[model samples]
Target chain A: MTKQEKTALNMARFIRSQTLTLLEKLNELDADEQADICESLHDHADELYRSCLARFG
Target chain B: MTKQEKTALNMARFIRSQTLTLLEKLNELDADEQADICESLHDHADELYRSCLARFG
Candidate 1:
């Protein structure tokens, strides 16, 4: 496929692997707690997305 | 920058931004032998270098 096509929608892409990784690793957390961590990851992912845009865009 | 320089010595690169990231967030880990951690990412995958990237390059 597209070896990670660069784009502005990275608002939804960058750090995606990292986000999944965080989810994959945090199994001990309850559903609610996991959701909390996911939300935090979303926030961090947003920032990382912006930074990646500046870096590779 | 090579979309992460395709290497196993990522011992020197990867687990990097993440480690610094953890340090930035949790404020723990003296990074005792951070060098030791680095040694783990190194690899003899020399043949897996630029020539491989030829698929896209």
Candidate 2:
């Protein structure tokens, strides 16, 4: 694969792993705590998505 | 706000916009096409998430 493709694939793996970690953490929390953290998580994910677009797109 | 916070917020906005665009495009597609694109889109989102983490985290 080209360097760009490899980089993209690696990035995908990292994101998948991070998402799994996030899900696990959320699973351990109470409903109210999970709701709060879910909001923060969405904000974080949205921020992350934009940064990736600017840097990679 | 601190520079980092501003940047993060901007990034989040960008992501929210992109996701909306993606959704719009998907809405215009047929079911099979939507499914195919959705798979790619998920991969792309995952990659973007990882890239953001690496650069901003």
Candidate 3:
């Protein structure tokens, strides 16, 4: 694969792994705590998407 | 930009938008319902990330 393709794939893999870790860890906390972190993650994912668009589109 | 980059970016944007919509709608439900939907979304997001990696990698 091209360098850019490799980079994107690696990043996507990393993000997926992080999400799994986050979900596992979040389950250990109370519902309110989970909600707080989940909201933050959702927002961060939103920005990542937007940034990718502006950068790659 | 390369076509691969554009495709990846578009899919990311679509997934991110869906996440936000899911979050917003979940807010209108009770805590249990919210948790259920959020859990499902989290799982779905996890799968999407994996799919992106596999497809783009």
- Give the top-scoring candidate (lDDT): 3
Cα lDDT tens digits, model 1, B1-57, are 343223312311233344244323222223223222222211111111122233212
lDDT of 1 by residue, A1-43 (tens): 1233243223224334444544443333233343354445445
Segments in model 1 whose C-alpha atoms lie over 4 Å from true places: A1-14, A17-30, B1-57
lDDT of 2: 0.42
Q: What local lDDT does model 3 show for residue A1?
A: 32
TM-score of each: 0.30, 0.32, 0.31
lDDT over C-alpha atoms for residue B2 of model 1:
40
Q: Is candidate 1 or candidate 2 better by TM-score?
A: 2
Task: Give the Cα-based TM-score of candidate 3 against the true structure.
Answer: 0.31
What is the C-alpha lDDT profile of model 3 across A1-57, one tens digit per residue?
334533433343344445444444434433344434445555454444344334333
Angstrom error at residue A31, model 2: 20
Among the numbered candidates, top TM-score falls to 2
Per-residue alpha-carbon lDDT of model 2 for B1-57, expressed as tens digits? 335533443443344345444434434433333334334544444444444444344
Candidate achieving higher DockQ, 2 or 3: 2
Error of 2 at A35 (Å): 12
- Candidate 1: lDDT over CA atoms? 0.34
Q: Please, what are the lDDT tens digits per residue for candidate 3 over residues B1-57? A: 346434543444455445545444334333334335445555556555444444334
User: Residue B51 lDDT in model 3?
Assistant: 46
Where does candidate 3 chain B have its weakest 10-residue lDDT segment?
Answer: B26-35
- lDDT by residue for model 2 (A1-57), tens: 245433443443344344444444434433234334334445444544444444345
